[PDB]
Write a protein that binds this ligand. Structure first.
Ligand SMILES: Cc1ccc2[nH]c(C(=O)O)cc2c1
Length: 168
């Protein structure tokens, strides 16, 4: 149904809301939720752990089956697997983990995976355990994504800093 409500429109195609991505998925019933994935689709932490828990581990079981046959993703890459109870599809997208020395330049490749989907519910890529500057990630999102992206930021203080930064 893609019933996004209460978003702030930043650009013609980028929207943001102070919200929990799991509660947004349940409310909105998106066609596609983006996972903040790692290359082995091991969803023990970060947004990936929250999504997986909300699928009662179905996302991890599917991901383990996928990886054993298909091999890992690349940093900046993606795959499309089931959205389970959260969405029709899950676009697993690997942003660079700058806490572990990966190239922040790959955040552009990471966001280019969104352009194959008309509308997405998504987290800010490379935030949290991936260690990237969120203000930078929002800029790369706005510069790179052409399709409609609805970003969910749960931390209110970070949300407020992102909106204040974007309106400068
Ligand atoms: C949760 C869920 C499941 C199946 C779904 N299909 C669609 C669609 O856009 O056709 C959205 C959606 C959301």
């Amino acid at each position: 149904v893609n019933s996004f409500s209460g978003y702030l429109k930043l650009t013609d195609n980028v929207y943001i809301k102070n919200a929990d991505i799991v509660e947004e998925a349940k409310k909105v019933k998106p066609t596609v939720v983006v996972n903040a994935a790692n290359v082995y689709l091991k969803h023990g932490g970060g947004v990936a752990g929250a999504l997986n828990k909300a699928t009662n581990n179905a996302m991890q079981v599917e991901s383990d089956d996928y990886i054993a046959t298909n091999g890992p993703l690349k940093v900046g890459g993606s795959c499309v697997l089931s959205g389970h109870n959260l969405a029709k599809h899950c676009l697993h997208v690997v942003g660079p983990n700058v806490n572990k020395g990966e190239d922040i330049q790959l955040l552009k490749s990471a966001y280019e995976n969104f352009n194959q989907h008309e509308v997405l519910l998504a987290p800010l890529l490379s935030a949290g355990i991936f260690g990237a500057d969120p203000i930078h990630s929002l800029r790369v999102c706005v510069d790179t994504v052409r399709t409609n992206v609805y970003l969910a930021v749960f931390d209110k203080n970070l949300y407020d800093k992102l909106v204040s930064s974007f309106l400068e």
